[PDB]
């Protein structure tokens, strides 16, 4: 699937439960894996609008070349049936 070899850290605490679950299944069903923890193996971190990241987390992300994206990265990639440009979904670089 389109998320082959992607490992997503999910920081989406403030999404409705149904949406959290849909993000997970969208990821799993299309070749990806997800965690709730941020570690060197993450390729991406998905961050809903109400969540924030510490400086520690941001340093880790930079160090490990992790892509920061909003949930629309997942939703719209699934919709277009194609992995989109994650650079268009960065809550820190609009």
Numbering used by the authors: 4 to 97
Give verbatim excerpts from the published study on this entry.
pmcPARP4 is an ADP-ribosyltransferase (ART) that uses NAD+ as substrate to add ADP-ribose onto target proteins, a process called mono(ADP-ribosylation) or MARylation. PARP4 is also referred to as vault PARP since it can localize to the vault particle, a cytoplasmic ribonucleoprotein complex. PARP4 has a distinct domain composition relative to other PARP enzymes; however, the N-terminal region of PARP4 is homologous to a collection of domains found in PARP1, a regulator of multiple nuclear processes including the cellular response to DNA damage. Collectively, the study establishes the human PARP4 BRCT as a nucleic acid–binding module.
We identified PARP4 lysine residues K23, K24, K31, and K36 as potentially important due to their vicinity to lysine residues important for PARP1 BRCT binding to DNA. The structures superimposed with an RMSD of 4.3 Å (comparing 74 Cα atoms) and indicated that K23 and K31 in PARP4 approximate the position of DNA polymerase μ residues that are crucial for DNA binding. We mutated lysine residues to glutamines to remove the positive charge that might interact with the negative charge on RNA/DNA, while likely maintaining the local structure by keeping a polar residue in place. We determined X-ray structures of the four PARP4 BRCT domain mutants. As expected from thermal stability analysis, the overall BRCT fold was not affected by the different mutations, and superposition of the mutant structures with WT BRCT yielded RMSD values between 0.5 and 0.8 Å (comparing all 763–788 atoms). The K31Q mutant influenced the local surface charge at the K31 position, but also influenced the placement and charge location of the K24 sidechain. The K31Q mutant showed a stronger binding deficiency with an estimated KD value of 3 ± 1 μM. The K31Q mutant showed a greater deficiency with a KD estimated at 61 ± 12 μM, and the K23/24Q mutant showed no apparent interaction. The TM of WT BRCT was measured as 51.6 °C ± 0.2 deg, whereas TM values of 54.7 °C ± 0.4 deg, 54.3 °C ± 1 deg, 58 °C ± 1 deg, and 60.0 °C ± 0.7 deg were obtained for BRCT mutants F39A, F39Q, K31Q, and K23/24Q, respectively. The mutations resulted in perturbations to electropositive regions of the BRCT surface that are expected to engage nucleic acid.
